[PDB]
Amino acid sequence: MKLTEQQLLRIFPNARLVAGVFVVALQRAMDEREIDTPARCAAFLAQVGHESSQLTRLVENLNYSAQGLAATWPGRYLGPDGQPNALALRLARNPQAIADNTYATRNGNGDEASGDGWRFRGRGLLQITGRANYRLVGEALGEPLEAEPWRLEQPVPAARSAAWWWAGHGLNELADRGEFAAITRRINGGLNGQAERLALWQRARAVLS
Template sequence: MPITEQQLLQILPKARPVAGIFLPALNRAMLRWKIDSRVRTAAFLAQVGHESGQLRALSENLNYSADALVRTWPSRFTAETAPTYARQSEKIANRVYGGRMGNGPESSGDGWRYRGRGLIQLTGRANYRAAAQALGLPLEEQSELLEQPEHAAQSAAWWWAQHGLNELADAGRFKDIGSIINTGQPGRTPNGAAERQALYDIAMRVLA
């Protein structure tokens, strides 16, 4: 069920400057990956709307203060080490994402190279590689491609389908969808849970 620009802006009003660019990309991606019913579309738009600041942030913002680093990644930063990373986005990404998700160690620069991008904030070299194979794009070599609307939408819809989120939407398990996207496991409360739910409620009304 393709959506109209009017519907998109009713759901994500802050997307007004980019709605015309994203609308065809979103409709193509949702069609390709079978996000094709009211509940699937509402859930998808609500989650990617939250993850991307309503389609306006296609690259992860890692501009954290020292206090925020310790709160967000207590296993990676202490009160002593955090000040040497604070407000240095590239250095922070390499620290928090280094040595996991298919990335090389902190010194490799993979953390920054494969930081969260696209409408669902695809993160880590392993995810970029899998998306590259599925979408036929050279994402490992040109990771910034995920900041283009078409690829941002396709990568998000591909990840959504790969993780069984259409089926969770069908089952009405919207909260679990947010948990899987944000925390990697159902049942845990994701960041921004209230906003995700509010966007979903709006989308369900708009798409009725």
């Protein structure tokens, strides 16, 4: 394989500003994890491109309204009334407080007071969340992700972390067989955004063919 910046802009047009640095980051991460054929690369690029809004969103958005908190984490933020409860009202529209509360004690995070929920909110192309996962990924990649979680918003850690996760979940062999929807299920635990993933995938297959 070989990916050209021309090919990137045709697949991720909204990455014009980042495509220059991402092209080397992606090419190297893809070689590193044997994402090494048009079929493997098209599937990989289609999935990470959906999950990262074409390389423009590498950090999770926690700007929820009180109604959004109640819809998203109802066991936490929905009252017996069908209305946002008092906790939802207290945290509404405050991303740091939302993450610090919602993700406390999740995936190796400390408690609310630790600030771990915000500190280790989702980052990357295929997003990594929680202290223990930043630790695990940082150690697999030889980068200081637990100490510097913001590194996952930068091209090389984002690309290498996504390629590592991809190859480690058997997604290369799924791509070999053309089982794209089965890849979507493994990444999403469902088929949310499948229509969008499929359109990116068919673009990428045409470009990389």
